[PDB]
Design a protein around this ligand. Structure first.
Ligand SMILES: Nc1nc2c(ncn2[C@@H]2O[C@H](COP(=O)(O)CP(=O)(O)OP(=O)(O)O)[C@@H](O)[C@H]2O)c(=O)[nH]1
Ligand SMILES: [Mg+2]
Ligand SMILES: [Zn+2]
Ligand SMILES: [Zn+2]
Ligand SMILES: [Zn+2]
Lengths: 107, 177, 97, 112, 270, 171, 551, 84
RNA sequence: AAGACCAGGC
DNA sequence: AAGTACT
DNA sequence: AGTACTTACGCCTGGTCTG
């Protein structure tokens, strides 16, 4: 994880996806001043083990594509650093039934 | 129609329908690897005459029976004995079956489900393909030539000598009349 | 009288499957066409009499179906074909799911 | 969080008139407009581009244009869509048709 | 549009909300699996009210001359005062009604207590009342166990989803949660005996009803909820016949279009 | 050559017969629209085996009328000749252009010119025949033919066969 | 539907395979040579020439013949014809792609313009979505205008690997009318891309190239977006209109084909006669035109192909375009039978779930009942009664699929019914029906009611069930639909009946109430102030039909 | 794919759509001279006989419940509880 | 009979 | 007319 | 930054002119 101030050089950024497995991410100061996850609206998410996932499907008899998705750039997706394929469990409050469990796969 | 155990995924261009011949290339519906209802694989079913005569008889009979479980609430001698089994358990408009029973029972070569049993226990040691292990059972044959010629699909799959012993043991078992 | 989009949308709402089909078919269009089990088109030359059926081109005589569909639809298709687009009608699912 | 907003906003459009609508509905809608990925609009430029078979998107704003590019890239249609069946004159998988009905010959005996 | 946009959506046999592809949209219609039709505004008493009143109403302490059930209510009243093995059930019950509180106050910040929910309990009892001509004079005949141990066994049979595993039998507890709070709220020992003098009969009945009246409020796998939802909105959007912001029909248009340049952009910061 | 292929069929039953003994009627109708049928892909459906254990499965009720539809999975003895198959039968008809031998339920015909040479055709015979140095072929005589080509048609299958090869002729 | 029985098994459509027509199939399928442009008059003699419409396609004049297919008019659908073009033409709607494809592949050797070799390309080949590959691909190589021969592999940019050959520069392209043009770059080189050319480059494109691009080896090869053989919709798609005999009545379509045909022959007769080389491509545009307009007419390239009198011309597309047309106005919604409409009025004497059907209509509308021992009697009575008295019927139908018109038929009063026969009878007291008021935007804009045959001419519905339909009696009309299958009704009475609609889910509360008089009045009658004396109390009691007779 | 009578997971109760369609379907047949498995207390309206067969749970039908992925579960009018 | 408009009803 | 999307 | 692209409530009853 690297933290740039005003910005990085477009000549630079194109050097992150050049040493796999290893992964890197880029964050601007101004976007980390406030934790977006603390906002009244944004409910809490959770990463699912490649085990917990292969289960979520088998229990709902779902194909990967029939699952509700989240953006690879989606703010919270970055706060946890998802990877194309990683599923998230979204647990929020409900005026119909206290808690509702939901899932968001990534794309 | 009467559908047939495998759904050959026809993708628009139906064209290749090979030749039917004693090259053992029979319609797709008769490869040697077909599928049983239970969902299993099973060798083709090759019936040599007078073996068919028995299988057709077998059912036509066990039919007459279960056809009364619900009603409570020597050559020429077989011609009559069968016509009856029919005028009882047949469509009576199955002129085909009638004619199949005559032929099947006139040209037959075995009367004992025991004799026909050996016929089978014998040829089934060849590794030969079912259509042969049928033409062999219902076709008279004295020489390997009368054979390997009226059944070209044999030509190299068996030495003349062996195919000849089998032929010897055929006319030996060949029930009389 | 009219049984349009909106009035349909309600029957779907009600979840009144059959009644919907009924207004849409048996009480309006309804038509019996023939198909090729091979090339899903109306090609088939049905002589409902001598049972002859054919379909030269995809050439058949054996694999042939009969389906009931809203004439308007037949026409939808024919019109499409005339625009060189092919609407295949198949009576079995091979794609699973 | 967005969903939560989209909903919240929409809810305010129905309450400002003193009318009441049970969550579930605006909820569902808000959801449909959001699962996919971000904000999918209820318009010819959105939900009418999704993986839904042709015939269904056919019945809305682009018709022919949509049909054309269907035989072009040889699309396949499930006929699981409401519209689909309606166009064919078939009983659609909807309420009364979310299943099949059969004659169990067995139980058709103990009944006599 | 609204309609064409949701036709295909309906509740499938697994109790999920999907469209024509198979894409889940809601994993439980309405985040609760209840058919809107079977629902009424009830009140979650547990929420509103000073921390004081709460105690005087839901608290029971069998180890105290002034916080125990006066034997004038329970048949086995005098022989309870002190019993320590009961005070644990009794205390479990309370440390729960307590959790319920905070939980609710974490969901409905407003403090609003009236919400739509299945099974009208208020009335379900009202009937029990005059159905057994319960006299407010003589005492009940409920073991404290009878109560607290049936209320629990009740929640157990309020099934929405039925799965045979964990991931499922877990969504279960969820889709119910909100209900039970109301439930535990209205079937609290003190209440059950001091407010509505139910006998064992009354109670065992009140219980049967709730379970079945609930299993009725579930949603039928078949409902073409998509269309429904659409109409439910567009409909009242026609009756709209028209403090200084874009509001109403032109607005709803804006929203659905996912328009970038809204006439009014505002934004409230606290 | 005769076969025992595993088939299946679809029968649409009117509610009328939704009786106590339905199974019975089905089977029976199976046998009406099968035994004696003919296709190029199956040949001759001659006889349904194991009448008893016929699998009916659960049939579904259509959706406009009450007729139900069961996929009857059975098994039977079929027989469909081929080009290059050697079979012998009984002659039936015999004319100037040849004689027709009857192999089973089918009828194979032999062209005069598809026979040998030394064999001529005697018209002034009664019954009609074909004479040779030593061989005599007529009505009831048994021959062994080699099927050169097949032709499917309506509810039957004919075919031409030769007796111009070796080990072919009368028996 | 249709009548006549067919030994053809019957199924439901399960999948729909969208393909493109291969000139080859187009031919195969057809049964019409279609060489002449004329209609009929074999020298005025009436019939049809083996030229256009009927060189064996469908027919007219109420005459069996449909290629012996007999059956006649109703139950012959049309039988496509074809008509070999003179020179390949574009497909008005595909042009958009035919272009984009070329900008995607270069001519001469016809093959991709970016292989596994280039990495941005890789990411563009994993995408499993025609709309998405072909859209990412395009964007990625629409800019490169040189057929690279050699490119720097996964190793050193120093080392150069070799692939396909022919660096013949790639020309950018633009759309001008119905033709494609491109320059080749000192100074450009502008030439017209002949259809005859494009076709080729496509024909040669690779199998894995098709697919890599959003296509399909069996159902839609690019080489097909270019027309060579044109299918010819049969009469029923473009039927006529006769004013008895010696006149005309031809359909718009049957003309643009007539056109296309003309414009096709004129061409041909030039490539085999005095062919002034480039005085031909002036009449090849005409074809490209017609064979384009025939399908579309609302293009930006102006000319509407106005047909004599300046009437627009109905392009096939136009027939399907949203609303009023096929898809939306014919299939998704239809005019229907067993339906009535009139004015509605209040009638405080009907149960909620009823609805007053005027005798006039009850006698018009019918229900197909099937003769059964349970009814036989009742039924024969209705049949005896005739189609004029009320409780009666107006059509008997036996197994032999024949209609006995009760109002005529010398056997009117005769007839013995037969179990199995059906008896179209009149709607009767308590036949469930679907009632409704447009605009329909509620489950409830349509509910089922109990039919109550009444005099006078107006659907009489109960008051409280007013607000759901949202109706006033100020002259508002309503529609009534009548079920038909014993199972059809079932669906109405079990899910659509008004009593079930009482508690609306659109707002988890009841949706019908008590209004006007009943409301206003119900208050007055309540007040402590309000007292009622015996003489009346008694009548009032009497009115509540379920009064237990206990003053 | 099918599913064992055990491991069953659907709703033990009959859905309105089901019951609705069963009665209809059943009527249709009864109305077609299909055999009636109950004593007609004098009834003569199919959908009414159907209502009867359905209360003595003597309707020989089976409701196949397809799932989103294709597999189904089979319940009998017998089993299925009828609250409504 | 088809298709364009105009008036109009709720 | 506008709003959006594509060039 | 300019230009183009597909849309636009539901149903229903009148009378009128023309290629
Ligand atoms: N589809 C349509 N529904 C309409 C139309 N006019 C009215 N309605 C319906 O009838 C409705 C009620 O208000 P109105 O517009 O009738 C006015 P009015 O003053 O006559 O109302 P009342 O006070 O109820 O007599 C109106 O809300 C719409 O729900 C219309 O042009 N189209
Ligand atoms: Mg009005
Ligand atoms: Zn075909
Ligand atoms: Zn024809
Ligand atoms: Zn090149």
């Amino acid at each position: 994880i690297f933290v740039y101030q005003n910005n990085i050089t477009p000549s630079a950024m194109k050097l992150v996806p050049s040493i796999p497995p290893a992964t890197i991410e880029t964050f601007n100061e101004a976007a980390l001043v406030v934790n977006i996850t603390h906002h009244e609206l944004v409910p809490k998410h959770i990463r699912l083990s490649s085990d917990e996932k292969r289960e979520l499907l088998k229990r709902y008899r779902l194909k990967e594509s029939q699952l509700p998705r989240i953006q690879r750039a989606d703010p919270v997706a970055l706060y946890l650093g998802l990877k194309r394929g990683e599923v998230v469990k979204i647990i929020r409050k409900s005026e119909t039934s206290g808690r509702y469990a939901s899932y968001r796969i990534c794309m | 129609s009467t559908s047939t155990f495998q759904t050959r995924r026809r993708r628009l261009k139906k064209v290749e329908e090979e030749e039917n011949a004693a090259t053992l290339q029979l319609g797709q519906e008769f490869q040697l690897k077909q599928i049983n209802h239970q969902g299993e694989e099973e060798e083709l079913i090759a019936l040599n005459l007078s073996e068919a005569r028995l299988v057709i008889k077998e059912a036509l009979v066990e039919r007459r029976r279960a056809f009364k479980r619900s009603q409570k609430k020597t050559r020429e001698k077989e011609l009559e004995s069968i016509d009856v089994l029919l005028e009882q358990t047949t469509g009576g408009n199955n002129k085909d079956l009638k004619n199949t029973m005559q032929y099947l029972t006139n040209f037959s070569r075995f009367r004992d489900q025991e004799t026909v049993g050996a016929v089978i226990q014998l040829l089934k040691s060849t590794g030969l393909h079912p259509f042969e292990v049928a033409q062999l059972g219902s076709l008279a044959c004295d020489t390997a030539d009368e054979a390997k010629t009226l059944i070209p699909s044999l030509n190299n799959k068996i030495s003349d000598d062996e195919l000849e012993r089998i032929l010897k043991e055929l006319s030996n078992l060949e029930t009389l009349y | 009288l009219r049984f349009g989009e909106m009035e349909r949308d309600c029957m779907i709402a009600h979840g009144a499957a059959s009644f919907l089909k009924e207004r849409l078919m048996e009480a309006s269009d309804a038509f019996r066409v023939h198909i090729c089990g091979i090339c899903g088109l109306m090609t088939v030359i049905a002589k409902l009499n001598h049972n002859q059926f054919e379909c030269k081109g995809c050439d058949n005589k054996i694999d042939i179906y009969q389906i009931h569909i809203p004439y308007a639809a037949k026409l939808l298709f024919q019109e499409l074909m005339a625009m060189n687009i092919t609407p295949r009608l198949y009576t079995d699912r091979s794609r699973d799911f | 969080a967005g969903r939560a907003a989209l909903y919240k906003e929409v809810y305010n459009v129905i309450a400002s008139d003193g009318s009441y609508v049970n969550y579930r509905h605006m909820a569902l809608l808000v959801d449909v407009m959001t699962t996919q990925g971000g904000l999918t609009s209820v318009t010819r430029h959105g939900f009418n581009r999704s993986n839904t078979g042709a015939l269904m998107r056919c019945s809305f704003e682009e018709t022919v244009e949509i049909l054309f590019e269907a035989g072009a890239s040889a699309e396949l249609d499930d006929c699981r869509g409401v519209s689909e069946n309606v166009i064919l004159g078939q009983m659609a998988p909807i309420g009364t048709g979310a299943f099949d009905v059969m004659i169990d010959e067995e139980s058709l005996v103990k009944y006599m | 549009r609204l309609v064409k946009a949701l036709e295909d959506i309906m509740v499938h046999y697994d109790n999920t909300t999907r469209n024509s592809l198979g894409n889940v949209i809601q994993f439980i219609y309405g985040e609760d699996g209840m058919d809107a039709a079977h629902i009424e505004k009830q009140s979650l008493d547990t929420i509103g009210g000073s921390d004081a009143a709460f105690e005087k109403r839901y608290r029971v302490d069998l180890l105290n001359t002034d916080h125990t059930l006066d034997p004038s209510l329970l048949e086995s009243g005098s022989e309870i005062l002190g019993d320590l093995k009961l005070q644990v059930l009794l205390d479990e019950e309370y440390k729960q009604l307590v959790k319920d509180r905070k939980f609710l106050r974490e969901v409905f910040v407003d403090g609003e207590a009236n919400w739509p929910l299945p099974v009208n309990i208020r009335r379900i009892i009202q009937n029990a009342q005059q159905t057994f001509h319960i006299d407010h004079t003589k005492p009940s005949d409920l073991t404290i166990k009878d109560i607290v141990l049936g209320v629990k066994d009740l929640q157990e049979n309020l099934l929405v989803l039925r799965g045979k595993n964990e991931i499922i039998q877990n969504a279960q507890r969820d889709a119910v949660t909100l209900f039970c709070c109301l439930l535990r709220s209205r079937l609290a020992t003190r209440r059950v005996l001091q407010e509505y003098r139910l006998t064992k009969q009354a109670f065992d009945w009140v219980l049967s009803n709730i379970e079945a009246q609930f299993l009725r409020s579930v949603v039928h796998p078949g409902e073409m909820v998509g269309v429904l939802a659409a109409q439910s909105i567009g409909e009242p959007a026609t009756q709209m016949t028209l403090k200084k912001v874009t509001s109403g029909v032109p607005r709803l248009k804006e929203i659905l279009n996912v328009a970038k340049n809204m006439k009014t952009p505002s934004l409230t910061v606290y | 050559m005769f076969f025992i292929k595993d088939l299946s069929l679809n029968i649409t039953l009117h509610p009328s017969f939704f009786g106590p003994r339905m199974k019975q009627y089905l089977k029976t109708k199976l046998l009406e629209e099968v035994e004696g049928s003919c296709t190029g892909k199956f040949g001759y459906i001659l006889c349904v085996l194991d009448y008893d254990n016929i699998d009916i499965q659960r049939g579904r009720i259509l959706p406009t009328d009450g007729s139900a539809e069961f996929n009857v999975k059975y098994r039977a003895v079929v027989f469909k000749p081929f080009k290059g198959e050697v079979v012998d039968g009984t002659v039936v008809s015999c004319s100037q252009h040849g004689f027709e031998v009857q192999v089973g339920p089918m009828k194979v015909f032999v062209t005069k010119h598809l026979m040998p040479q030394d064999l001529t055709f005697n018209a002034g015979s009664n019954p009609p025949s074909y004479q040779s140095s030593e061989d005599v072929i007529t009505i009831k005589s048994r021959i062994r033919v080699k099927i050169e080509g097949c032709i499917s048609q309506v509810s039957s299958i004919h075919a031409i066969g030769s007796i111009k090869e070796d080990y072919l002729g009368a028996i | 539907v249709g009548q006549q029985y067919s030994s053809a098994p019957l199924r439901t459509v399960k999948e729909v395979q969208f393909g493109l027509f291969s000139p080859e199939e187009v031919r195969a399928i057809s049964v019409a040579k279609i060489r002449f442009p004329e209609t009929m008059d074999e020298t005025q003699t009436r019939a049809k020439i083996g030229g256009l419409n009927d060189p064996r396609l469908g027919s007219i004049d109420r005459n069996l013949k449909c290629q012996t297919c007999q059956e006649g008019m109703n139950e012959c659908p049309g039988h496509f014809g074809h008509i070999d073009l003179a020179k390949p033409v574009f497909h008005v709607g595909f042009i958009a792609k035919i272009k984009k494809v070329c900008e995607c592949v270069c001519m001469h050797c016809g093959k991709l313009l970016l292989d596994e070799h280039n990495e941005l390309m890789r990411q563009a080949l994993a995408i499993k979505d025609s709309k998405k590959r072909f859209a990412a691909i395009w964007t990625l190589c629409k800019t490169k205008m040189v057929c690279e021969t050699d490119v720097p592999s996964e190793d050193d940019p120093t080392q150069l690997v070799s692939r396909g050959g022919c660096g013949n520069t790639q020309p950018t392209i633009r759309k001008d009318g119905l033709k494609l043009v491109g320059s080749w770059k000192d100074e450009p080189e502008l030439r017209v891309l002949s259809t005859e050319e494009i076709l080729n480059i496509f024909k040669h494109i690779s199998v894995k190239d098709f697919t890599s691009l959003g296509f399909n080896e069996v159902f839609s090869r690019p080489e097909w977006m270019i027309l060579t053989c044109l299918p010819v919709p049969p009469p029923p798609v473009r039927p006529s209109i006769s004013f008895n005999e010696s006149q005309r009545g031809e359909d718009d379509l049957t003309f643009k084909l007539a056109d296309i045909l003309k414009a096709n022959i004129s061409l041909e007769t030039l490539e085999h006669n005095g062919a002034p080389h480039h005085a031909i491509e002036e009449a090849e545009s005409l074809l490209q035109f017609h064979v384009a307009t025939y399908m579309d007419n609302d293009i930006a390239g102006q000319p509407q192909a106005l047909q004599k009198s300046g009437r627009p011309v109905k392009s096939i597309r136009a027939r399907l375009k949203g609303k009023e047309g096929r898809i939306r106005g014919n299939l998704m919604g239809k005019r229907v039978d067993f339906s009535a409409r009139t004015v509605i009025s209040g009638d405080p004497n009907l149960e909620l779930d009823q609805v007053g059907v005027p005798k006039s209509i009850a006698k018009t509308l019918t229900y197909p009942e099937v003769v059964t021992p349970y009814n036989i009697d009742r039924l024969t009575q209705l049949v005896r009664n005739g189609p004029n008295e009320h409780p009666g019927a107006k059509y008997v139908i036996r197994d032999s699929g024949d209609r006995i018109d009760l109002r005529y038929s010398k056997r009117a009063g005769d007839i013995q019914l037969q179990y199995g026969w059906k008896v179209e009878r009149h709607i009767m007291d308590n036949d469930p029906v679907l009632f409704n008021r447009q605009p329909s935007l509620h489950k409830m804009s349509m509910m089922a009611h109990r039919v109550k045959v009444i005099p006078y001419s107006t659907f009489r519905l109960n008051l409280s069930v007013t607000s759901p339909y949202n109706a006033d009696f100020d002259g508002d009309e309503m529609n009534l639909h009548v079920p038909q299958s014993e199972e059809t009704r079932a669906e109405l009475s079990q899910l659509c009946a008004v009593p079930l609609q009482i508690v609306s889910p659109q707002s988890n509360k009841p949706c019908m109430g008590i209004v006007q008089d009943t409301l206003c009045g119900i208050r007055k009658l309540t007040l402590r102030d309000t007292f009622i004396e015996l003489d009346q109390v008694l009548n009032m009691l009497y009115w509540v039909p379920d009064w237990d007779g206990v003053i | 794919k099918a599913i064992p009578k055990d491991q069953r997971a659907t709703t033990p109760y009959m859905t309105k759509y089901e019951r609705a369609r069963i009665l209809g379907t059943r009527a249709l047949q009864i109305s077609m001279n299909a055999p009636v498995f109950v004593d007609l207390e004098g009834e003569t309206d199919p959908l009414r006989i159907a209502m009867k067969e359905l209360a003595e749970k003597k309707i020989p039908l089976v409701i196949r419940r397809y799932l989103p992925d294709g597999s189904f579960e089979d319940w009998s009018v017998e089993e299925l509880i009828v609250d409504l």
